[PDB]
Structures are given as C-alpha cells and as structure tokens.
Design a protein around this motif. Sequence first.
Motif, PDB file in Angstrom:
ATOM      1  N   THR D 227       0.931  -1.388   0.116  1.00  0.00           N
ATOM      2  CA  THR D 227       0.001   0.207  -0.219  1.00  0.00           C
ATOM      3  C   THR D 227       0.849   1.135  -0.138  1.00  0.00           C
ATOM      4  N   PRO D 228       0.350   2.209  -0.623  1.00  0.00           N
ATOM      5  CA  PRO D 228       1.128   3.545  -0.606  1.00  0.00           C
ATOM      6  C   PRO D 228       1.606   3.989   0.707  1.00  0.00           C
ATOM      7  N   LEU D 229       0.954   3.861   1.665  1.00  0.00           N
ATOM      8  CA  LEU D 229       1.491   4.135   3.056  1.00  0.00           C
ATOM      9  C   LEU D 229       2.688   3.221   3.645  1.00  0.00           C
ATOM     10  N   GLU D 232       5.509   4.207   2.019  1.00  0.00           N
ATOM     11  CA  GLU D 232       6.191   5.476   2.265  1.00  0.00           C
ATOM     12  C   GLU D 232       7.042   5.245   3.726  1.00  0.00           C
TER      13      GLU D 232
END
Lengths: 10, 10, 238, 238
Positions: D227-229, D232
Amino acid sequence: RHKILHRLLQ
Amino acid sequence: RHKILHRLLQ
Amino acid sequence: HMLSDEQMQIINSLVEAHHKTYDDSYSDFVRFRPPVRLSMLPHLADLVSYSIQKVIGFAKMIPGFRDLTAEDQIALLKSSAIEIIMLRSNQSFSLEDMSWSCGGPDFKYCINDVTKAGHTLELLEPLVKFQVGLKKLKLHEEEHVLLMAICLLSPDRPGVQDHVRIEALQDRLCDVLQAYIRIQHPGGRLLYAKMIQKLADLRSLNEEHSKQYRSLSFQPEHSMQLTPLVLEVFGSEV
Amino acid sequence: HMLSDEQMQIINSLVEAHHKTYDDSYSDFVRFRPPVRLSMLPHLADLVSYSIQKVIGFAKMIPGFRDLTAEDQIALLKSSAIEIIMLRSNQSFSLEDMSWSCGGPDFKYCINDVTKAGHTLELLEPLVKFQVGLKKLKLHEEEHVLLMAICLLSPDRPGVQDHVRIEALQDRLCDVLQAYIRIQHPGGRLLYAKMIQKLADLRSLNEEHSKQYRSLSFQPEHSMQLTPLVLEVFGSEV
Ligand SMILES: C=C1/C(=C\C=C2/CCC[C@@]3(C)[C@H]2CC[C@]3(C)C#CC#CC(O)(C(F)(F)F)C(F)(F)F)C[C@@H](O)C[C@@H]1O
Ligand SMILES: C=C1/C(=C\C=C2/CCC[C@@]3(C)[C@H]2CC[C@]3(C)C#CC#CC(O)(C(F)(F)F)C(F)(F)F)C[C@@H](O)C[C@@H]1O
C-alpha cells in the motif's frame, strides 16, 4: 517527501 | 520510472 | 470480398487474447477490498487496478505491440488504459438496471455507487450515456475486441515516439474492422463510422476522468486508498 | 514513594490514547483484502497499513510528540513503526495456540500464514519467541502503553535532529515507568530491566524485517501488492 505521513500528522 | 509496468510487460 | 488469412489470424489472436484476460464469472472480485455503502473508493481502486493488469495482458497479445519499444508500450498504455477499461466494461453493463452487474448485488455498481468513490456526475452521466450507445450498437465479439486494440494503438497519444510504426499498426487493424463489418455483419454500413465516433467520445471521457482523478489523487487521505499500479499508470511521471 | 500529578497525567493520556487507537473487536479487518491460504501478502499489507495509521494516532497523543518538528516526527515514526506494531500486536497474541487471534479463525495468523506473505523463519522464529517472553512478563495496561511510547521516543534513530529534546522526553517517560513499577506493581523489581531488554530485542527484529521487506519490495510483482502508506513508511526516502 512523505505526502501521506504529513497529512496523517495533521 | 514505471517499475511495475516494466515488470507486467515482462 | 472476403478477409485474408492475415486479417483472419489477427481476429483470432485478438479474440483469444480477450478470453484470456476477461473472466466472465468475476469470481476474483471477492479478493478486492469490500464494497461499502468515500466508502466505495477502496473497492473501485481494487477493481480498476485489477482491470489495468488485464488490459496489459491483452495489449501484450496484440500483434505488433510486443515489438514496440518499452517506452512506447508504456506511453500507449498510460494514456489509453481508462478508455480500454470503459470499453471492456461494456460487457458487464446492463440496460435493464442501467448499471454494471458483476456476479451479484454487492458487485452491481450504479452511478450512486461510483459517486462514493470520488467522482462527479460530470463524468458518470456522459459515461452511462456512452455505455448505452455502445451497448445499442450490438457489437460482435470480433468488433468489440477490434475496437479496443484500435484504441490501444492510437498514435495521437502524449509520449509516443515511433508514431509511424504505431499508425501502420492501427491502420492494419482498422482495415480488418472495416472489412469484417462489410463481409460478416448484416445491416452495418454505418457501423464503422459509429464505432469511430465511439472512439472520439472516449477521449472526452478520458479527459473528464483525468481531471477528477487529479483532484482525487492530490488529497493524501484519498490517494492512500489507491494502489501502487493505479498510481503509476494514472500518475504523471515521464 | 508515590507518583506525581504530572506522571499520573502522562499515564492517563497514554492509556486514553491507546484505547482510542486500538479496537479490541478487530471488526475493521473485514475491510481488508481477504486472507488466502504469496497468498497472504495482500491481507497482511492491509493489516500493517491499518496498524501504521493507529500507531500514528497514538504517537500524536503522546505528550510532547506533537511539539517536535515534522521532520523528527516522521523520522521517529519511520524507524519505530514496525516495533510499535510488534509491541501492540502482543495484545492479540495467544500462548494457547501460539498465534495472533483477531476475532475469528480467518483472522488467526500463525507462522505458516505469515510465511505466505513473503517472510522467512529467520524473522518469524525470534518474533514468536519475543511475543511469548513479552506475554510472560504479564504487563499492566499502563506498563504496556509506556513501553510503546518509550520505543517511539528513542533518540537513537536514523534521521532525528533534536536528539536533546527527544532524550528529555524519553527519560521523563522512563522515570514514569520505573516509578510506576516500584509503586504499583508487586513482585517486579527485575521488570524494568526485563522491559528494557525487550526494547533491545525489538531492534534486532526491526533489522531482520527491514532486510526481508527490502527483498520483498524490490520485486515489483510483490511491491504492487503493498500500500502507498506502507511503501512510504517502510521505504527509504529522505
Ligand atoms: C472495470 C470493469 C468493470 C466495471 C467498470 C466500471 C464500473 C465501476 C466504475 C468504473 C470502474 C467503471 C469503468 C470506469 C469507472 C466509472 C471508473 C473509475 C475510476 C476511478 C479512480 O479514479 C478511482 F475512483 F479512484 F478508483 C481510479 F483511477 F483510481 F481507478 C467490470 C467488468 O466489466 C470488468 C471491467 O474491467
Ligand atoms: C498488527 C497487529 C496485529 C497482528 C500483528 C501480527 C500478526 C501478523 C503478522 C505481523 C503483521 C504481526 C506483527 C508483524 C508481522 C509478523 C508482520 C509483518 C509484515 C510485513 C510486510 O513486509 C508485508 F509482509 F509485506 F506485509 C509489510 F511491511 F509490508 F507490512 C493484530 C492486532 O494486535 C493489531 C496489531 O496492530
């Protein structure tokens, strides 16, 4: 960067 | 860039 | 007239490619983040991300596509993807309830569902109007799959480099369609024109989606609900 | 001795913060991409991404954290996150079946489950050994929540800038724990040491996870399932 972390940290 | 598209394009 | 062996082959490899990248049972949708009634954003992001992969596998089996440079393949895919998705999604669209039905009531998406995924009526209204018109053209499998490959092989996309080679491909394909209809489709002497216009509609639709996705992706609280592939394909990196 | 009003407050705001960021019903897990028995990678990525958000909301309510620079807050979070996750996940860990049980049989994860999400025994074995030891310390709510905030406010992380301010915070917190145990915990005169060591274990664990995640994230076929998070937080951008 860290666009999401900045938001989530309001 | 496009790391995923390159892979998916084998 | 009748189609040549080469044209016939093209049709064959295209329809095969479609079957290999479209699961009429939609059983894989139970692997998406569930639908919720921006409550619908996680499920539709999962849906689109899934479709993008299928659109990629499809394109890989188009005669000639594999023989382009990766740059060009990515360029064609990054700009045509949502159009192929709108195009392919006609197969699940239903006129009787004006929605995309995918194996159940949970996987039935009306306009109101997609409005809960961050889109406005400005897109969804011309989209449904589009899907109905396209539905009404009652395309053959061969025509449907042709139209998608034509859309993929449009040379007027931002980023293409060998526009000469890509135009040659697209024309070769258009001849196959123009021919097919003439020979194999009774009562369709306006149809080719009607399909070509359907392409022009998709460009508008692409533009509206891009505006709205840009709005959506610029808010981290929402873009974090998207997927790495979606972000890659619909994102604007060169 | 007895705790001061300030210390008492710290405990209070910390336990409140824990309750606000931990849903003992795990009902939100039905919103994750389903578990499949790398079949488990989508569900566990969804699980971790969820936990990261909770860990962020927790940290935001730690006294003093909000008053650091964003740079530092991101730095502390990017390096302590998986440790807070391992720490907080003790609440769902069960000794009777040696797994994390989260409201059902589908949401019960043993070592074999996590092995289908791209991790090796090299991590999962010391991890379970960790969770058991920690489980065996039979921590109070106050102690558990303290230990997590201590871990968050470690100044020996890559990227911190005001190590002076962060050390002051961590010490203030450690005094609260060292004190709390003395006064409010019968038979725990080795416990503080035992908890401090639990922190040292987490660093090893962090390292092994980082090796394996790096392996995992370097393969696009797998990182696209993240996932993007997650990307990150666990990614290495400065
Ligand atoms: C996708 C298909 C089907 C239905 C398609 C459908 C029905 C649901 C809504 C879709 C997806 C529509 C076609 C296009 C549209 C209106 C949309 C969208 C969007 C969007 C996003 O901005 C969002 F919202 F963030 F997710 C993006 F880019 F992130 F994905 C079902 C089957 O026919 C397979 C086919 O492959
Ligand atoms: C997370 C919690 C719970 C269980 C935790 C559990 C049980 C499941 C496995 C987890 C998640 C474990 C703690 C850590 C561990 C072994 C892991 C991992 C990982 C990984 C990834 O590399 C992967 F695989 F790609 F997903 C990463 F980074 F992408 F996420 C359940 C509740 O206690 C809430 C708590 O907040």
